[PDB]
Coordinates of C-alpha atoms and ligand atoms in Angstrom, one line a residue:
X13 CA -0.1 -0.1 -0.3
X14 CA 1.0 3.5 0.6
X15 CA 4.3 3.8 1.9
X16 CA 5.0 5.3 5.2
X17 CA 5.5 9.3 4.8
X18 CA 8.3 9.4 7.4
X19 CA 11.5 10.9 5.4
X20 CA 15.1 10.0 6.0
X21 CA 18.5 11.3 5.1
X22 CA 20.8 9.0 2.9
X23 CA 24.5 9.4 1.4
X24 CA 24.1 10.0 -2.2
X25 CA 27.7 10.8 -3.0
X26 CA 30.9 10.5 -0.8
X27 CA 34.7 11.4 -1.0
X28 CA 37.1 10.4 1.8
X29 CA 39.5 13.2 3.4
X30 CA 43.2 13.3 3.2
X31 CA 45.8 15.6 4.7
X32 CA 47.2 16.7 1.9
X33 CA 50.3 18.2 4.0
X34 CA 51.2 14.4 5.4
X35 CA 53.9 12.8 3.6
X36 CA 56.2 9.3 3.5
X37 CA 58.3 9.0 6.7
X38 CA 61.9 10.9 5.9
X39 CA 60.3 13.1 3.3
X40 CA 60.3 16.9 3.1
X41 CA 57.0 18.3 4.1
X42 CA 54.6 19.5 1.6
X43 CA 52.6 22.7 1.5
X44 CA 48.9 22.8 1.0
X45 CA 46.6 24.4 -1.6
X46 CA 45.0 27.6 -0.5
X47 CA 42.5 29.9 -1.7
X48 CA 42.0 33.7 -1.2
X49 CA 39.0 35.3 -2.4
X50 CA 38.2 32.7 -4.8
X51 CA 35.3 30.2 -5.6
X52 CA 35.5 26.5 -6.1
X53 CA 32.7 24.8 -8.1
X54 CA 32.7 21.0 -7.7
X55 CA 30.6 18.5 -9.3
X56 CA 29.6 15.0 -8.3
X57 CA 27.2 12.4 -9.6
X58 CA 24.5 11.6 -7.2
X59 CA 23.5 8.0 -6.4
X60 CA 20.3 8.5 -5.0
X61 CA 17.6 10.9 -5.8
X62 CA 14.8 12.8 -3.1
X63 CA 13.4 16.0 -2.2
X64 CA 15.9 17.5 -0.1
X65 CA 19.5 17.4 0.2
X66 CA 22.2 18.4 3.0
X67 CA 26.1 19.0 2.1
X68 CA 28.8 18.0 4.4
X69 CA 32.0 20.1 4.5
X70 CA 35.0 19.4 6.5
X71 CA 38.2 20.8 8.0
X72 CA 39.3 17.5 9.2
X73 CA 43.0 18.0 8.5
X74 CA 43.2 21.7 8.8
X75 CA 45.7 23.4 11.3
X76 CA 43.3 26.5 11.8
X77 CA 40.0 27.1 11.4
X78 CA 38.5 27.8 7.7
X79 CA 35.4 29.9 7.1
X80 CA 33.1 29.1 4.1
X81 CA 31.7 32.4 3.1
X82 CA 29.1 31.0 0.9
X83 CA 28.1 27.5 -0.2
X84 CA 25.5 27.0 -3.1
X85 CA 23.8 24.1 -5.1
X86 CA 22.7 23.9 -8.5
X87 CA 21.6 21.1 -11.3
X88 CA 25.0 20.8 -13.3
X89 CA 24.4 21.5 -17.1
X90 CA 28.2 20.3 -18.1
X91 CA 31.4 21.7 -17.7
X92 CA 31.4 24.5 -15.0
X93 CA 27.8 25.5 -16.0
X94 CA 24.7 25.2 -13.8
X95 CA 21.0 25.6 -14.5
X96 CA 20.5 28.8 -12.5
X97 CA 16.9 28.1 -11.8
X98 CA 17.9 25.4 -9.5
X99 CA 20.6 27.6 -7.7
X100 CA 20.2 27.4 -3.9
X101 CA 21.8 28.8 -1.1
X102 CA 23.1 25.9 1.3
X103 CA 22.8 27.1 5.1
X104 CA 24.2 26.2 8.3
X105 CA 22.0 26.5 11.1
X106 CA 20.1 29.4 9.0
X107 CA 23.5 31.4 8.5
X108 CA 25.1 31.7 5.1
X109 CA 28.7 31.6 6.4
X110 CA 30.2 28.9 8.7
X111 CA 33.7 28.5 10.2
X112 CA 34.8 24.9 11.0
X113 CA 37.6 24.5 13.5
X114 CA 40.4 22.3 12.8
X115 CA 39.5 18.7 12.9
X116 CA 35.9 18.9 12.5
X117 CA 33.2 18.6 10.0
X118 CA 29.7 19.8 9.5
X119 CA 26.5 18.8 8.0
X120 CA 24.5 21.6 6.4
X121 CA 20.6 22.4 6.9
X122 CA 18.4 20.8 4.4
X123 CA 17.8 22.3 1.0
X124 CA 14.7 22.1 -1.0
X125 CA 15.8 20.9 -4.3
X126 CA 14.2 17.8 -5.7
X127 CA 17.2 16.0 -7.6
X128 CA 17.1 12.5 -9.6
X129 CA 19.4 9.3 -9.3
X130 CA 22.5 9.3 -11.4
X131 CA 22.4 13.1 -12.1
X132 CA 25.0 15.6 -12.1
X133 CA 25.0 18.5 -9.3
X134 CA 27.5 21.3 -8.6
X135 CA 28.4 22.3 -5.2
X136 CA 30.1 25.7 -5.4
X137 CA 32.0 27.5 -2.6
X138 CA 33.4 30.7 -1.8
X139 CA 36.5 31.7 0.3
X140 CA 36.6 35.4 0.9
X141 CA 39.6 35.2 3.1
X142 CA 42.9 33.4 2.8
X143 CA 42.5 29.7 3.4
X144 CA 44.5 27.0 3.5
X145 CA 42.6 23.7 2.8
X146 CA 44.7 20.7 3.5
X147 CA 41.5 18.5 3.8
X148 CA 41.1 17.2 0.4
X149 CA 40.2 14.1 -1.8
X150 CA 43.1 14.2 -3.8
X151 CA 41.9 12.4 -6.9
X152 CA 38.4 13.1 -7.9
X153 CA 38.6 11.5 -11.5
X154 CA 36.6 14.8 -12.0
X155 CA 37.1 18.6 -12.8
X156 CA 36.7 21.3 -10.5
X157 CA 36.6 24.7 -11.4
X158 CA 38.0 28.0 -10.0
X159 CA 37.5 31.6 -10.2
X160 CA 38.3 34.8 -8.6
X161 CA 35.5 36.6 -6.3
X162 CA 32.3 35.1 -5.4
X163 CA 31.1 33.2 -8.2
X164 CA 28.9 30.7 -6.4
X165 CA 25.4 31.3 -8.2
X166 CA 26.9 32.6 -11.5
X167 CA 25.7 30.3 -14.6
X168 CA 29.7 29.3 -15.3
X169 CA 33.1 29.9 -13.7
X170 CA 35.0 32.6 -15.5
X171 CA 38.6 31.9 -15.0
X173 CA 40.9 28.1 -17.5
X174 CA 44.3 27.0 -16.0
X175 CA 42.6 27.2 -12.7
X176 CA 41.2 24.0 -12.9
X177 CA 41.9 21.0 -10.3
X178 CA 40.9 17.3 -9.9
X179 CA 40.4 17.2 -6.5
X180 CA 37.5 18.0 -3.8
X181 CA 38.3 20.7 -1.2
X182 CA 36.8 20.1 2.1
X183 CA 33.6 18.6 0.6
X184 CA 33.2 15.0 2.1
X185 CA 29.6 14.2 1.6
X186 CA 26.3 15.0 0.1
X187 CA 23.0 13.2 1.4
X188 CA 19.6 13.3 0.1
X189 CA 16.2 12.2 1.8
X190 CA 13.6 9.9 0.9
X191 CA 10.3 8.3 2.3
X192 CA 11.4 5.1 0.0
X193 CA 13.1 2.3 1.6
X194 CA 16.7 2.5 0.5
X195 CA 20.1 0.6 0.6
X196 CA 23.4 2.4 1.0
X197 CA 26.2 0.4 -0.6
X198 CA 29.8 1.6 0.8
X199 CA 32.6 1.0 -1.5
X200 CA 36.1 1.1 0.5
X201 CA 39.5 1.0 -0.7
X202 CA 42.3 2.5 -2.6
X203 CA 43.2 4.2 -6.0
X204 CA 41.4 0.9 -7.4
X205 CA 38.2 1.8 -5.6
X206 CA 38.7 5.4 -6.3
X207 CA 38.7 4.7 -10.0
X208 CA 42.4 6.0 -10.9
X209 CA 42.9 5.8 -14.6
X210 CA 39.3 5.5 -15.4
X211 CA 38.3 8.4 -17.9
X212 CA 37.9 11.7 -16.2
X213 CA 34.3 13.5 -15.9
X214 CA 33.2 10.2 -17.6
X215 CA 31.4 8.6 -14.4
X216 CA 33.3 5.1 -15.2
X217 CA 34.6 4.2 -11.9
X218 CA 33.6 0.6 -10.9
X219 CA 30.9 2.0 -8.4
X220 CA 29.8 4.2 -11.0
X221 CA 29.4 0.9 -13.2
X222 CA 27.9 -0.8 -10.3
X223 CA 25.5 1.9 -9.7
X224 CA 24.7 1.9 -13.6
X225 CA 23.7 -2.2 -13.3
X226 CA 21.3 -1.5 -10.3
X227 CA 19.5 1.2 -11.9
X228 CA 19.5 -0.7 -15.3
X229 CA 17.9 -3.5 -13.1
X230 CA 15.3 -1.3 -11.5
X231 CA 17.0 -0.5 -8.2
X232 CA 16.9 3.1 -8.0
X233 CA 17.1 3.2 -4.2
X234 CA 20.1 1.0 -3.9
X235 CA 22.8 3.8 -3.8
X236 CA 26.7 3.4 -4.3
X237 CA 29.0 5.7 -2.6
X238 CA 32.6 5.8 -3.2
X239 CA 35.2 5.9 -0.2
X240 CA 38.4 5.1 -2.0
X241 CA 41.5 6.9 -1.2
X242 CA 44.4 6.5 -3.8
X243 CA 47.3 4.9 -2.2
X244 CA 45.6 4.1 1.0
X245 CA 46.9 1.1 3.3
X246 CA 45.8 -0.9 6.2
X247 CA 48.2 -0.2 8.7
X248 CA 49.7 3.1 8.1
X249 CA 49.3 6.5 7.0
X250 CA 50.3 7.8 3.6
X251 CA 48.2 8.1 1.4
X252 CA 45.5 9.4 3.6
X253 CA 44.5 8.4 6.9
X254 CA 45.2 4.5 7.6
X255 CA 42.2 2.3 6.6
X256 CA 42.0 1.1 10.4
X257 CA 41.8 4.5 11.9
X258 CA 39.5 5.8 9.0
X259 CA 37.0 2.7 9.1
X260 CA 34.7 4.3 11.7
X261 CA 34.3 7.6 9.7
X262 CA 34.6 6.3 6.3
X263 CA 32.2 3.4 6.5
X264 CA 30.4 2.7 10.0
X265 CA 29.3 6.7 10.0
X266 CA 28.2 6.9 6.3
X267 CA 24.4 7.9 6.9
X268 CA 22.2 5.0 5.8
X269 CA 25.0 2.3 5.1
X270 CA 23.5 -1.2 4.7
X271 CA 26.3 -2.7 2.8
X272 CA 30.0 -2.5 2.4
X273 CA 32.5 -3.8 -0.1
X274 CA 35.8 -3.6 1.4
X275 CA 38.8 -3.8 -1.2
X276 CA 42.3 -2.8 0.4
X277 CA 45.7 -4.2 0.8
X278 CA 47.8 -3.9 -2.1
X279 CA 49.5 -0.9 -1.0
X280 CA 50.5 -2.4 2.3
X281 CA 52.3 -5.1 0.1
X282 CA 53.6 -2.5 -2.5
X283 CA 55.1 0.1 -0.2
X284 CA 57.7 -1.5 1.5
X285 CA 60.4 -2.5 -1.2
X286 CA 61.0 1.3 -2.2
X287 CA 58.6 3.7 -0.7
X288 CA 58.4 3.0 3.0
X289 CA 61.1 0.4 3.8
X290 CA 60.6 1.1 7.8
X291 CA 56.9 0.0 7.2
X292 CA 57.1 -3.9 6.0
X293 CA 54.3 -5.6 7.1
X294 CA 52.9 -9.1 6.9
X295 CA 49.9 -10.9 5.7
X296 CA 48.7 -11.5 9.0
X297 CA 49.2 -7.8 10.1
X298 CA 46.9 -7.2 7.4
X299 CA 44.5 -9.9 8.2
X300 CA 44.4 -8.7 11.6
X301 CA 43.3 -5.2 10.8
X302 CA 40.8 -6.5 8.3
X303 CA 39.0 -8.5 10.8
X304 CA 38.7 -5.9 13.2
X305 CA 37.3 -3.7 10.7
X306 CA 34.8 -6.6 9.7
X307 CA 33.7 -7.4 13.0
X308 CA 32.9 -4.1 13.9
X309 CA 30.6 -3.6 10.8
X310 CA 29.0 -6.8 11.8
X311 CA 28.2 -5.7 15.1
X312 CA 26.4 -2.6 13.6
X313 CA 24.0 -4.8 11.3
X314 CA 26.0 -4.0 8.1
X315 CA 26.4 -6.9 5.4
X316 CA 30.1 -6.9 4.4
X317 CA 31.8 -8.2 1.3
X318 CA 35.4 -8.6 0.8
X319 CA 37.2 -8.3 -2.7
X320 CA 40.2 -10.3 -3.2
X321 CA 43.3 -8.6 -4.2
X322 CA 43.7 -8.2 -8.0
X323 CA 47.1 -9.8 -9.6
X324 CA 49.4 -7.1 -10.0
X325 CA 52.5 -8.8 -11.6
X326 CA 54.6 -6.0 -13.6
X327 CA 53.8 -3.1 -11.4
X328 CA 57.3 -1.5 -11.1
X329 CA 59.1 -5.1 -10.7
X330 CA 61.4 -4.9 -7.6
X331 CA 59.9 -1.6 -6.4
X332 CA 56.3 -2.0 -5.7
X333 CA 55.5 -6.0 -6.7
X334 CA 58.0 -8.4 -5.4
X335 CA 57.9 -12.0 -4.7
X336 CA 57.2 -11.1 -0.8
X337 CA 54.2 -9.3 -2.1
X338 CA 53.0 -11.8 -4.3
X339 CA 53.2 -14.4 -1.4
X340 CA 51.4 -11.9 1.1
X341 CA 48.8 -11.5 -1.5
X342 CA 48.2 -15.3 -2.0
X343 CA 47.9 -15.7 1.8
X344 CA 45.4 -12.8 2.0
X345 CA 43.3 -13.8 -0.9
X346 CA 43.2 -17.6 0.5
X347 CA 42.2 -16.0 3.9
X348 CA 39.3 -14.3 2.2
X349 CA 38.0 -17.0 -0.1
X350 CA 37.8 -19.3 2.9
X351 CA 36.4 -17.0 5.7
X352 CA 32.9 -17.9 7.4
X353 CA 33.2 -14.4 9.4
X354 CA 32.3 -12.3 6.1
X355 CA 28.8 -12.3 4.3
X356 CA 30.3 -12.8 0.9
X357 CA 33.4 -12.8 -1.4
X358 CA 33.7 -10.7 -4.6
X359 CA 36.4 -12.3 -6.6
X360 CA 38.0 -9.3 -8.5
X361 CA 41.0 -11.4 -9.0
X362 CA 39.2 -14.0 -10.4
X363 CA 37.1 -11.7 -12.8
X364 CA 40.1 -9.5 -13.9
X365 CA 43.3 -12.0 -14.3
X366 CA 44.9 -12.6 -17.4
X367 CA 44.0 -16.3 -18.7
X368 CA 47.3 -16.4 -20.2
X369 CA 49.1 -15.9 -16.6
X370 CA 46.8 -15.6 -13.4
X371 CA 49.8 -13.5 -11.8
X372 CA 49.0 -10.6 -14.0
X373 CA 46.0 -8.4 -14.9
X374 CA 44.1 -9.3 -18.2
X375 CA 45.8 -6.9 -20.9
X376 CA 42.2 -5.9 -22.0
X377 CA 41.8 -4.5 -18.3
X378 CA 45.3 -3.0 -18.4
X379 CA 45.3 0.5 -17.9
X380 CA 48.9 0.1 -19.0
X381 CA 50.7 0.1 -15.3
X382 CA 50.1 -3.4 -14.5
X383 CA 48.0 -2.2 -11.6
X384 CA 45.1 0.1 -12.2
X385 CA 42.4 -1.2 -14.4
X386 CA 41.2 0.5 -17.7
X387 CA 37.3 1.7 -18.0
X388 CA 36.8 -2.0 -19.3
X389 CA 38.8 -3.4 -16.4
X390 CA 36.3 -1.3 -13.9
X391 CA 33.3 -2.3 -15.8
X392 CA 34.4 -5.7 -15.3
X393 CA 34.9 -5.6 -11.6
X394 CA 31.2 -4.2 -11.5
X395 CA 29.8 -7.1 -13.6
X396 CA 31.8 -9.6 -10.9
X397 CA 29.1 -8.3 -8.5
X398 CA 25.9 -10.6 -7.9
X399 CA 23.3 -7.6 -7.3
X400 CA 21.3 -10.2 -5.0
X401 CA 23.9 -9.6 -2.3
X402 CA 23.2 -5.8 -2.1
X403 CA 19.3 -6.5 -1.7
Ligands
CL1 CL1 42.9 -20.0 -2.5
CL2 CL1 29.8 -12.0 -6.5
CL3 CL1 18.1 -9.6 -7.6

């Protein structure tokens, strides 16, 4: 009959945050980008539609407060353009300006803009003051547009070479519905992030998963992306360690019902050359995984773990090694035999080279023997049984 009219918020799009100034042990410290009397217009693809939306802004890794002088939202018509008839002020407890102390995040007021699944909205931020921004999602696989002055309500951004592929201080977009809704969180590294998939093409594997769900009729099963390029389970860089960020980036995602966990290859590949002081074992990796899994089951989430895709050829002797291949096979065997998880997604089986299972299938090779191409990410999405996400 009639669906109960109670309304709830659901994560429709996400981006995990990193500290752009944090560097590998022994490296020279890095500077953060800054804005000064400028506007950033982000573009993001919504997984779930609904009637109102909220915007989550973040200063999680700032060293000083920042002040969002204005935040606006509108439907995207491509490039930096918006449909100004949909332009809306995003307020924070009634205010149009909001200050976030260092290490905090804030959800905005609800905004009355009806939006559809698999459509692009634009979130525009204006920083009047000189603003350091170390809280970023480094590789968005998506063009952001920067311009002088407060251009948050403009038809487009007038700049250029002032483009980025990051997200600055923007971490989540929630939308409301009365419908029953599933939120699938994909948690991982570059390969969940969608690195070497086509920019602005929405061809990350969670994008293609989302496409498959909507084609099958599940407009109310959302997929949100919580990858971080270069992420590791046991150590900071790139981005907060998988274990330290699992509470924020998986457990606290608004409305989470499912999780696909795919992380580890950087724990294996960093120790040859990038972080020799950070050699880890397959057992230490499995210990972190099961703590994450056990937490998520304790909260009612259905947990799926993906096998580590083959990566022979990926800088032989400097990322891939025989030690890494051994650790990868122990981890894959554990995943494949675990009775603690709700299910396995055999990404490795789906994507391996039939000529040589230790390498990625050449037609899915972006060319570096590690990262899939668009076809490889379509193949990852195809490997997932949609009944698991119901
Ligand atoms: Cl096995
Ligand atoms: Cl499956
Ligand atoms: Cl089904």
